[PDB]
């Protein structure tokens, strides 16, 4: 079998991507945040406290002949940027992209935090991590892609996506024509569970090219790109008036800049970032001060490849019996 579903940014600034997910029978369709830097498939429900939905879709189990409360599990997450949700869970039928599992657990919440609250546009989110960092307890339980894997054509997903524009995920097979010359396969450790690798190393704009290991993780769920201060601040030195900011979280710069590409390695191979993909515009609205696509990894323990260095690339997360991680040009 294989599926494919398109992904949408929820905004101007691909803050994020939405992609719409079946659970359920008849359906119920939520668009969901497909996170490859975790593991648990959450939903705002008809269980959530009232007061922490503000016009997201819910799924209502009980309309749903194929629910099944899994008894006595519950979850509880917490997430890199500070975000949690928790509740109890179901079992259900989920289909993406005309790829259904059955008995795929669907977490149910019952209490999110205020980010989730105020973006109406997520109504949760679905994990594509390695299933042992999944929340479930007393009884772990698998991805979306855990489950279908067997079923696939291929042990494989793919991201493609957009810049300011919608992309597609598919599972099972690799669309190659969704990508210019080849795709560089470069090897993961699974030890902290996410798809994480090594990159070979950077270059800023036309700059020479430094070759240093970066070991990181491919995070979809992650809006922008985290490195190590050194790489950050090499890149921000090239940018007239560019600075780092205590008060606003990182680097801003001016928007009347034209900001220089990012260069990351694959191997032997090279993605290229435009400098346009770094822009995340305003700090406030008005403001001439904008925020950047690149920030220091420092404090946060991991480097982070997310949606601004994936969306440069056409991504395969092999999820074959030694997982690997591919990448090409698009």
């Given at each position: 079998?294989?599926?494919?579903?398109?992904?949408?940014?929820?905004?101007?600034?691909?803050?994020?991507?939405?992609?719409?997910?079946?659970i359920g029978?008849?359906?119920?369709?939520?668009?969901?945040?497909?996170?490859?830097?975790?593991s648990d498939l959450w939903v705002?429900s008809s269980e959530?406290?009232?007061?922490?939905?503000?016009?997201?879709?819910?799924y209502?189990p009980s309309?749903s002949?194929t629910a099944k409360l899994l008894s006595g599990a519950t979850w509880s997450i917490?997430?890199?940027?500070?975000?949690?949700?928790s509740g109890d869970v179901y079992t259900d039928t989920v289909?993406?992209?005309?790829?259904?599992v059955t008995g795929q657990a669907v977490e149910s919440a019952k209490?999110?935090?205020?980010?989730?609250?105020?973006?109406?546009?997520?109504?949760?989110?679905?994990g594509?991590?390695?299933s042992?960092?999944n929340t479930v307890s007393p009884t772990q339980q698998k991805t979306f892609?855990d489950n279908?894997?067997?079923?696939?054509?291929?042990?494989?997903?793919?991201?493609?996506?957009?810049?300011?524009?919608?992309?597609?995920?598919?599972?099972?097979?690799?669309?190659?024509?969704?990508?210019?010359?080849?795709?560089?396969?470069?090897?993961?450790?699974?030890?902290?569970?996410?798809?994480?690798?090594?990159?070979?190393?950077?270059?800023?704009?036309?700059?020479?090219?430094?070759?240093?290991?970066?070991?990181?993780?491919?995070?979809?769920?992650?809006?922008?790109?985290?490195?190590?201060?050194?790489?950050?601040?090499?890149?921000?030195?090239?940018?007239?008036?560019?600075?780092?900011?205590?008060?606003?979280?990182?680097?801003?710069?001016?928007?009347?800049?034209?900001?220089?590409?990012?260069?990351?390695?694959?191997?032997?191979?090279?993605?290229?970032?435009?400098?346009?993909?770094?822009?995340?515009?305003?700090?406030?609205?008005?403001?001439?001060?904008?925020?950047?696509?690149?920030?220091?990894?420092?404090?946060?323990?991991?480097?982070?490849?997310?949606?601004?260095?994936?969306?440069?690339?056409?991504?395969?997360?092999?999820?074959?019996?030694?997982?690997?991680?591919?990448?090409?040009?698009?």
């Open positions: 079998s294989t599926g494919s579903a398109t992904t949408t940014p929820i905004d101007s600034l691909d803050d994020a991507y939405i992609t719409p997910v079946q029978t008849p359906a119920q369709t939520l668009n969901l945040d497909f996170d490859t830097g975790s705002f959530t406290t009232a007061s922490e939905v503000d016009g997201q879709t819910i209502t309309k002949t917490s997430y890199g940027d500070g975000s949690s949700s289909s993406v992209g005309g790829l259904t209490k999110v935090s205020s980010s989730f609250t105020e973006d109406s546009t997520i109504d949760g989110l679905l594509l991590a390695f042992t960092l892609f279908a894997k067997a079923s696939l054509d291929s042990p494989v997903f793919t991201a493609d996506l957009g810049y300011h524009a919608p992309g597609t995920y598919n599972f099972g097979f690799i669309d190659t024509t969704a990508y210019t010359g080849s795709i560089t396969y470069t090897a993961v450790s699974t030890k902290q569970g996410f798809w994480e690798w090594t990159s070979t190393g950077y270059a800023v704009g036309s700059g020479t090219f430094k070759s240093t290991s970066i070991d990181g993780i491919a995070d979809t769920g992650t809006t922008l790109l985290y490195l190590p201060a050194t790489v950050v601040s090499a890149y921000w030195a090239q940018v007239s008036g560019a600075k780092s900011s205590s008060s606003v979280g990182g680097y801003v710069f001016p928007c009347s800049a034209t900001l220089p590409s990012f260069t990351f390695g694959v191997g032997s191979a090279r993605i290229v970032i435009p400098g346009d993909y770094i822009d995340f515009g305003p700090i406030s609205t008005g403001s001439s001060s904008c925020f950047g696509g690149i920030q220091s990894s420092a404090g946060i323990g991991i480097n982070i490849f997310g949606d601004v260095a994936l969306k440069a690339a056409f991504v395969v997360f092999n999820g074959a019996t030694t997982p690997t991680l591919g990448f090409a040009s698009k």
